[PDB]
Amino acid sequence: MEVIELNKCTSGQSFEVILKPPDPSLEEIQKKLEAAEERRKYQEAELLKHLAE
């Protein structure tokens, strides 16, 4: 049980005790968002079309 790297200051202290040794791009995000947006717009188009019928 070895205490090491003990550091002391006015508001406490720290140390360590050992017991035993042993990204999508900006474009890339906008496209996914717009890809989903169109799928929405498409489904709405199918609905309004169905209603029109």
Binding site: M1, V3, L6, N7, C9, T10, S11, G12, Q13, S14, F15, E16, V17, I18, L19, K20, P21, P22, D23, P24, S25, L26, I29, L33, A35, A36, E37, E38, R39, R40, Q43
Partner: protein, 437 residues
């Protein structure tokens, strides 16, 4: 002195956010109007608490925080509450229409509308930072905003601030307080999308917090207000090193270094003690021995699981109050001989310890009693993977019948993203299985 900006997303994040800042202010002697008598460097300074607060010429200390929600009723409470003076209007951003407990709606549909505005209001905080460390993101797994908008935000932060560190405080879903049947879906969806963009995440399971309130504070039926105050304490302990003079976990990078050997396994279990009722007439103050021992009781963990049946990759002790090393060592000496504490064979079976002599601060008229010493333990145990297991099962049950899936596809998502997110979670549950073997 490097700054830290906090981002509170959705009701949970916002409501938990409001509690931490109420607490911080009490702890740093900062009044509601923002004045701070003990601070002598007016309108300036690079003290430790400046990593969380900035200063105005008038001598006001302004939280480096941004509140976001796709609906205003919750953030409106901040705008009009006890600490309305603390925050500046640009920091509080609200939409019109929430995500309806729907990841896809928060991420794609409504996220696209409000994302750029958010990144700007954040950029305005970043521009006022001499050396920004990174972000602390607070949110729920189950909410549509909390899950869906947060992961979008996280993706884009990694773009606009590729070098900065990102820590998470995530509220994991519990039926005793959950507000939706699809929170399992949202949880997996947001985890799958956020995984690569989060350096360290602390999960708080409402189930665990709920019972701790009942068991230890004798609260019949805990409200979010009870839950959030216990949660605020644990959060305060974790961020204290960044806000006070110390030498352990002094920056966001250190959390990663001390608690996260493997990037994907970045969910440290937190355990806190002691939790004592304020309405308790007579109390006998707990020692270092007793509180350090409670850290190994599942009943005190932020997530209910059993570390005895897993391996540790790291363990870190954060004390607050009347404590000195000898006592900690002697407490650890005993505990080792009376517990099943097993590390992965490829790590040192040790403990990084940190003590701040200032005992925990409690809110006037709060359910928590004042103590002379307390401790939060962060340990990266493979046992927390039990929580992924529970979740993955619930997800499997509903998805097998495609229940509720139409609500997500209807918002522009695709069944595909459901099974991608689930496979990744299957990987996570295996990565834990190997390390843990």
């Amino acid at each position: 002195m490097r700054e830290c900006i906090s981002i509170h997303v959705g009701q949970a994040g916002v409501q938990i956010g409001n509690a931490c800042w109420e607490l911080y202010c009490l702890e740093h002697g900062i009044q509601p109007d923002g004045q701070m008598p003990s601070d002598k460097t007016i309108g300036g300074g690079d003290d430790s608490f400046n990593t969380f607060f900035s200063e105005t010429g008038a001598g006001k200390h302004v939280p480096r925080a941004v509140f976001v929600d796709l609906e205003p009723t919750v953030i409106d409470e901040v705008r009009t509450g006890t600490y309305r003076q603390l925050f500046h209007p640009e920091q509080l951003i609200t939409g019109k229409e929430d995500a309806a407990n729907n990841y896809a709606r928060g991420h794609y549909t409504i996220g696209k509308e409000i994302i750029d505005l958010v990144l700007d209001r954040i950029r305005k905080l970043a521009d006022q930072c001499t050396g920004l460390q990174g972000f602390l993101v607070f949110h729920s797994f189950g909410g549509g905003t909390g899950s869906g908008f947060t992961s979008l935000l996280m993706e884009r932060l990694s773009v606009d601030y590729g070098k900065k560190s990102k820590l998470e405080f995530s509220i994991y879903p519990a039926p005793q307080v959950s507000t939706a049947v699809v929170e399992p879906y949202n949880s997996i969806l947001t985890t799958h999308t956020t995984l690569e963009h989060s350096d360290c995440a602390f999960m708080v399971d409402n189930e665990a917090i709920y019972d701790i309130c009942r068991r230890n504070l004798d609260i019949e039926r805990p409200t979010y207000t009870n839950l959030n105050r216990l949660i605020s304490q644990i959060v305060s302990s974790i961020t204290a090193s960044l806000r006070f003079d110390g030498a352990l976990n002094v920056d966001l990078t250190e959390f990663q270094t001390n608690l996260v050997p493997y990037p994907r396994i970045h969910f440290p279990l937190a355990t806190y003690a002691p939790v004592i009722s304020a309405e308790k007439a007579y109390h006998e103050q707990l020692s270092v021995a007793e509180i350090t021992n409670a850290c190994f009781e599942p009943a005190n963990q932020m997530v209910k699981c059993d570390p005895r049946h897993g391996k540790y990759m790291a363990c870190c002790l954060l004390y607050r109050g009347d404590v000195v090393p000898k006592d900690v060592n002697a407490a650890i000496a005993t505990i080792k001989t009376k517990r099943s504490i097993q590390f992965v064979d490829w790590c040192p079976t040790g403990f990084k310890v940190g003590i701040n002599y200032q005992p925990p601060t409690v809110v006037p008229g709060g359910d928590l009693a004042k103590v002379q010493r307390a401790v939060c333990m962060l340990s990266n145990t493979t046992a927390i993977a039990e929580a992924w297991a529970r979740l993955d099962h619930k997800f499997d049950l509903m998805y097998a019948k495609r229940a509720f899936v139409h609500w997500y596809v209807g918002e522009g998502m695709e069944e595909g993203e459901f099974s991608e997110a689930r496979e990744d979670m299957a990987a996570l549950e295996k990565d834990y299985e190997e390390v843990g073997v």
